[PDB]
């Protein structure tokens, strides 16, 4: 079969699970499209009522950030006309403001001029879809694809720079505030059976060290890669280029969504990691099986430098499996953070700038996750797993 027709196979990660994930490889003829365009993209995915198998084939570049006429939108195409950079800096300024919450007439603004742009750039995938890139150059700029249903493909697509022009202060986020932004490349919101596959995700032509700093904080216009919140279940992601980004993936977005206990089942595999700063992935409650990823980056890196790999939080059952992390000084235990109610990790063949660690041991949690991932195909040794996956993650590297 074409990439348009193939399925995940049988063996292959959380997304086989049960009824397995085979998108819309059953589409009749008048259900297969090609889009070059917003309009054409919105107009094939139509409303979560087009659950029929469909096959979207995307030819080139396609523009999220676009009226319905295909003209380019930019901050001032999307601003509330109360909104205004300066006097949202000047109102909420720590040195006046102090630390409590943004509120009154400009944060008001800010978060019109905000859902202005989502309107434009957030699209939903409906059920039994298979969306896949033509050819080795398909786009999709400034786009965040939601996945909330059921039997969803994504593959052989560079998605480039979810970038929200208006973000969000919080100065009670960390000890000295942050920046927050709306838009992932891929969110799935309670979706299952998913694969995405041979996918490049980036910060375009606009990365992090772009963008200014306003009070000490990175004016942060991106949010995460490949993000998966509230109860999203049975998904594989494998062979994707992750590179030049702060936050990738993020597995469970809360300590309170106790619901997600029991869900979050998604395996990574033969993903490339290159100068992502963290949360490769962030893991809340989930049955994890991360296997055969290469991560490379630098600790010292002024555009994007490594924070850590996986992150164990609340209740994660990280199972990790000949991973390869080439750090230069980075320490064992630092190939991860531990957060509050994260206690538990397994990782077996490890490979840290070349040698063996363990990486849980080195941070004193248990071994036991309390299972072992059944649904997977051949694991590389960790030796060929630098290689494998350079050669082979991304977008481009099919057609
Ligand atoms: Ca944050
Ligand atoms: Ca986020
Ligand atoms: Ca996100």
């Known amino acids: 079969a074409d990439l348009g027709h193939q399925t995940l196979g049988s063996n292959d990660g959380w997304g086989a699970y049960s009824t397995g994930t085979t998108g819309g490889s059953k589409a009749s003829s ?24 469909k096959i979207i084939y995307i030819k080139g570049t396609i523009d999220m950030n676009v009226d319905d006429n295909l003209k380019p939108l930019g901050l001032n195409d999307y601003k509330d006309p109360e909104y205004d950079l300066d006097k949202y800096l000047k109102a909420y300024d720590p040195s006046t403001w102090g630390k409590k919450e943004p509120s009154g007439t400009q944060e008001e603004a800010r978060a019109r001029s905000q859902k ?118 049975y998904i594989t992601m494998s062979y994707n280029y992750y590179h030049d980004h702060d936050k990738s993936s993020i597995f469970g977005s809360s300590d309170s969504k ?24 962030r893991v809340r409650f989930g049955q994890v099986h991360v296997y055969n990823n290469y991560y490379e980056g630098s600790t010292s890196s002024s555009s994007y430098p490594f924070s850590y790999a996986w992150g164990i939080g609340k209740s994660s059952k ?41 990486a849980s041991a080195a941070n004193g949690l248990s071994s036991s996750v309390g299972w072992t991932p059944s649904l997977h195909g051949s694991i590389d040794a960790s030796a060929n797993v630098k290689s494998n996956v350079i050669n082979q993650a991304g977008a481009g590297k099919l057609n």
């Open 258 to 281: 106790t619901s997600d206990d029991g869900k979050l089942k998604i395996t990574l595999h033969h993903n490339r990691y290159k100068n992502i700063v963290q949360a490769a992935p």
């Open 30 to 53: 008048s259900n297969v499209y090609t889009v070059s365009n917003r309009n054409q993209l919105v107009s094939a995915l139509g409303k979560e009522t087009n659950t029929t198998p």
């Open 116 to 233: 202005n742009q989502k309107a434009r750039v957030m699209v939903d995938i409906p059920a039994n879809t298979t969306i896949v890139g033509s050819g080795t150059n398909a786009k999709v700029v400034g786009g965040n694809f939601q996945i909330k249903s059921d039997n969803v493909i994504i593959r052989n697509i560079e998605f480039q720079d979810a970038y929200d022009y208006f973000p969000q202060w919080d100065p009670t986020d960390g000890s000295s505030g942050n920046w927050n932004s709306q838009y992932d490349n891929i969110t799935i919101n309670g979706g299952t059976h998913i694969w995405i596959d041979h996918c490049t995700f980036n910060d375009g032509s606009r990365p992090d060290s772009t963008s200014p700093k306003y009070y000490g904080r990175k004016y942060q216009h991106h949010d995460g890669q490949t993000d998966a919140s509230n109860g999203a279940n």
């Open 318 to 358: 990280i199972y990790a499996q000949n991973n390869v992390i080439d750090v230069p000084g980075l320490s064992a235990a630092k190939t991860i953070s531990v957060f509050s109610g994260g206690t538990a990790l397994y990782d077996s063949g490890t490979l840290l700038n070349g040698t063996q660690i363990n």
